[PDB]
Amino acid sequence: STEYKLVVVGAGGVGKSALTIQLIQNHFVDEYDPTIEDSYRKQVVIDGETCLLDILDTAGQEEYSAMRDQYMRTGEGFLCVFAINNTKSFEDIHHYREQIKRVKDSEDVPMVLVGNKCDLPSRTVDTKQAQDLARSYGIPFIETSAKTRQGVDDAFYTLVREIRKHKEKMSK
Ligand SMILES: Nc1nc2c(ncn2[C@@H]2O[C@H](COP(=O)(O)OP(=O)(O)NP(=O)(O)O)[C@@H](O)[C@H]2O)c(=O)[nH]1
Ligand SMILES: [Mg+2]
Ligand SMILES: [Mg+2]
């Protein structure tokens, strides 16, 4: 049953761990417990295929460029998370994407842009700027809330679909 290695990247506090824990354990972690590196394995069926998701939940700011290069080299595709009330988190996406491209020596890497915390009224990142950026990069954009579970399964399942597409492309 095909294995997909998914890496959740983004600035600190955007809800990378909350999103992942909603997917794997079906509840919302209210506390902020900063991550070092966590990994999860999970069995799912997407489009009729049984997938083993190996998900790496990364740190917000890493104490080693080597740890970062390591997860960028391993990952088959990347959930690029920002929080809709954190402009710098959104701005950081470009920088994560650049480093991923450079680490893999490739211009086409499977990725989904995730605007988390869509439940908050405190928005500083507009859905159009995010849609524009994704459109530029040629990747899907999904708005999510780890608190309500809105879009959570959509985000990870879409990333799997992106990986499947990339493999089909790389062979053609
Ligand atoms: N309102 C709301 N809060 C959220 C959402 N997702 C995460 N949070 C909250 O934001 C805080 C940080 O979440 P967390 O998942 O730990 O962020 P992280 O991106 O994993 N942080 P780090 O990079 O340090 O590990 C927590 O208090 C959490 O409850 C969401 O969709 N909505
Ligand atoms: Mg975390
Ligand atoms: Mg980070």
Residue numbers in the entry: 1 to 172
From the paper:
The RAS family of oncogenic proteins is important as therapy targets because of the frequency of activating mutations in almost all major cancers. All family members function by signal transduction to the nucleus of cells via interaction with effectors (such as RAF, RALGDS, and PI3K) that catalyze phosphorylation of downstream proteins. When KRAS is bound to GDP, the protein is in the inactive state and becomes activated by nucleotide exchange from GDP to GTP. Mutant RAS proteins remain in the active state and hydrolyze GTP at a much slower rate than wild-type (WT) RAS.
As a comparison with the KRAS169Q61H crystals, we also determined crystal structures of WT KRAS188, mutant KRAS188G12V, and KRAS188G12D (all isoform 4B) with a GTP analog (GppNHp), using crystallization conditions similar to those described previously for full-length KRAS188G12D.
